[PDB]
Ligand binder design. Structure first.
Ligand code: NA
Ligand code: NA
Ligand code: NA
Length: 480
C-alpha cells in the first residue's frame, strides 16, 4: 500500500553459534514488521566449512542444516526446519525474504587432487611468478552425508581454476590451475580479481553454469525466496551473473528482488557493472558506505555538502540499496569501515528518510555487537523507521547548502495521513535552517521524533518553517 520499503540484514559477524538464530527470526517477525521492516536479508543458509562458519565458507549449497556434514547437521543459524518455520512467519507478517547467494567459490573440500598449477603475482594475477608444477589442492566434493538428495552433482578440480593453498608442499600462493584462464569479465584490481579465496569456480565450463542455475532455482523454490543478495559479484564473471539472474527470473512465478554486492569505493565501477547487468538489479551503495565512514573518522571538518557526492544513490537512486554498515565493515572484519556511534544516527537518517535508494538496517546496529561492546541502537533506529514508515512521503526538497548544518524535507502525500517531515542535522556546532515543506502544511506544529531538540516548529502561511539541531546531532520533525 504505497508503504516505503525497508530491508534488514538479520545477522552480524559475531552472532552466537547456538543454532538458535532461525528461531529468533521466527519470533522477532511481527515486532520487525511492526517497526517498519518489510524485507529481511538472511545470511548464507547452507553448510559452510564448519558449523561456526558465518556462511561464506560455503561447502554444500544443498545442505541447509539438514545433513550431518562438516562436523554438524545444523548451520550456525539452525536447522532447515527451523529456517522454513522462520520464513513462514516472515511471510505471514508481510516481510519478503532475500537469500544470500555465494557462488564465487567453495571451501571445505572433502579431499585433495593433483593439479598442474602456476604461481601468479598477487597484485597482478595476469603475471605468473613461477612455472607449472603439480600441487595438491582441496577440490574434491562428495557431500557424503547428503546422499545425493536434491542433486548428485559432485565437484572436482576441473570445475575450478585456482586456489590459495598447496597441500603438497604446504605453502600459500595464488595458484592459477595450468591451462585454465582467470574468469572474465571481472574486477580489474590486481590485474584480474577473479581469485579471492577458497576454490575459485571457473564459469567457462557449461556444466558449472547449469549446475548453479539449476541449484539457484532449486534453492529459490525450496525456500520460496522473494529475492537474492548476490555475494562477491565483482569476482564472478559479469556475464554469468547477468545470465544467472535472467535464468532465475525465468523459472520463478514470484517476483525476485536482486541486490548485488560489488564492493568497490567507486561509483563508476558500480555503474559499469550495472551497464553489463542492464540494470536488472540494484547494488549496495558502497561509495556511500565510505562517505559516511570518511565523515565519521574526520569529524566536523568534513564538509557535509559532499556527503552524498559520489554515492550510487545520488546517481541512480533506483538501483541503489543504501546501508551504514555490515558484517564486513564492523570492527575487526575484512572490509572494516565502521561508522562511530556519534555519526551513525546521522547516516541512518540519511538513508531512511530520503526518497532515493532502498535502505537497509544492520542487525549489528539494531541489537548491538556485544563482542565489541557496541550498544544496541534500536531506540534511535525505531524512531527513524517510524519516520520512514509513516512520514517520509511526498515531494522532497534538499538543502545541502552549508558545510555543517544541512537538511531536507518531504511534503507528505495526501494518500498517507499526517505524513511529511523535515530532517535537519549538523556534524559540527549545531544550528537551524529555513526550509520549505509544502504550503499545504501551513499552520501545523512539527516536533522532533528523535528527541534531540525540543524546538516546536510551526509552518507559516508560505509553507515555511525554521528547524533546529544541536551540534553533531540530527532531528526529524513531523506533524505528530
Ligand atoms: Na571468482
Ligand atoms: Na561505513
Ligand atoms: Na562540517
Amino acid at each position: 500500500d504505497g508503504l516505503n520499503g525497508t530491508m534488514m540484514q538479520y545477522y552480524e559477524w559475531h552472532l552466537e553459534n547456538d543454532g538458535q538464530h532461525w528461531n529468533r527470526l521466527h519470533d522477532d517477525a511481527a515486532a520487525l514488521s511492526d517497526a517498519g521492516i518489510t524485507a529481511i536479508w538472511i545470511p548464507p543458509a547452507y553448510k559452510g566449512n564448519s558449523q561456526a562458519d558465518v556462511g561464506y565458507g560455503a561447502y554444500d549449497l544443498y545442505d541447509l542444516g539438514e545433513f550431518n556434514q562438516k562436523g554438524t547437521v545444523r548451520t550456525k543459524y539452525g536447522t532447515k526446519a527451523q529456517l522454513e518455520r522462520a520464513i513462514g512467519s516472515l511471510k505471514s507478517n508481510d516481510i519478503n525474504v532475500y537469500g544470500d547467494v555465494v557462488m564465487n567459490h567453495k571451501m571445505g573440500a572433502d579431499f585433495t587432487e593433483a593439479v598442474q598449477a602456476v604461481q601468479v603475482n598477487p597484485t597482478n594475477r595476469w603475471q605468473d611468478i613461477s612455472g607449472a608444477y603439480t600441487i595438491d589442492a582441496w577440490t574434491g566434493f562428495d557431500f557424503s552425508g547428503r546422499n545425493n538428495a536434491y542433486s548428485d552433482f559432485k565437484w572436482r578440480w576441473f570445475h575450478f581454476n585456482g586456489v590459495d593453498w598447496d597441500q603438497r608442499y604446504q605453502e600459500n600462493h595464488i595458484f592459477r590451475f595450468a591451462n585454465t584462464n582467470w574468469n572474465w569479465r571481472v574486477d580489474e584490481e590486481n590485474g584480474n580479481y577473479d581469485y579471492l579465496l577458497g576454490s575459485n569456480i571457473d564459469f567457462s565450463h557449461p556444466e558449472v553454469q547449469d549446475e548453479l542455475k539449476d541449484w539457484g532455482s532449486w534453492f529459490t523454490d525450496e525456500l520460496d525466496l522473494d529475492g537474492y543478495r548476490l555475494d562477491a559479484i565483482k569476482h564472478i564473471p559479469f556475464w554469468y551473473t547477468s545470465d544467472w539472474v535472467r535464468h532465475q527470473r525465468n523459472e520463478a512465478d514470484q517476483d525476485l528482488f536482486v541486490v548485488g554486492e560489488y564492493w568497490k569505493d567507486d561509483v563508476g565501477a558500480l555503474e559499469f557493472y550495472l551497464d553489463e547487468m542492464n540494470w536488472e538489479m540494484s547494488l549496495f551503495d558502497v561509495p556511500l558506505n565510505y562517505n559516511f565512514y570518511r565523515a565519521s573518522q574526520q569529524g566536523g571538518s568534513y564538509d557535509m555538502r559532499n556527503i552524498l557526492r559520489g554515492s550510487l544513490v545520488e546517481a541512480h537512486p533506483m538501483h541503489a540499496v543504501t546501508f551504514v554498515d555490515n558484517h564486513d565493515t564492523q570492527p575487526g572484519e575484512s572490509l572494516e569501515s565502521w561508522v562511530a556511534d556519534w555519526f551513525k544516527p546521522l547516516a541512518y537518517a540519511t538513508i531512511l528518510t530520503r526518497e532515493g535508494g532502498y535502505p537497509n538496517v544492520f542487525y549489528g546496529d539494531y541489537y548491538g555487537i556485544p563482542n565489541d561492546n557496541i550498544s544496541a541502537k534500536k531506540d534511535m533506529i525505531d524512531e527513524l523507521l517510524d519516520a520512514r514508515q509513516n512520514y517520509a512521503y511526498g515531494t522532497q526538497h534538499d538543502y545541502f547548502d552549508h558545510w555543517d548544518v544541512v537538511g531536507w524535507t518531504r511534503e507528505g502525500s495526501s494518500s498517507r495521513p499526517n505524513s511529511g517531515l523535515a530532517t535537519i542535522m549538523s556534524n559540527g556546532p549545531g544550528g537551524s535552517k529555513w526550509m520549505y515543506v509544502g504550503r499545504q502544511n501551513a499552520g501545523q506544529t512539527w516536533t522532533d521524533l528523535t528527541g534531540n531538540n525540543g524546538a516546536s516548529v510551526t509552518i507559516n502561511g508560505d509553507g515555511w518553517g525554521e528547524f533546529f539541531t544541536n551540534g553533531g546531532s540530527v532531528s526529524v520533525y513531523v506533524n505528530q
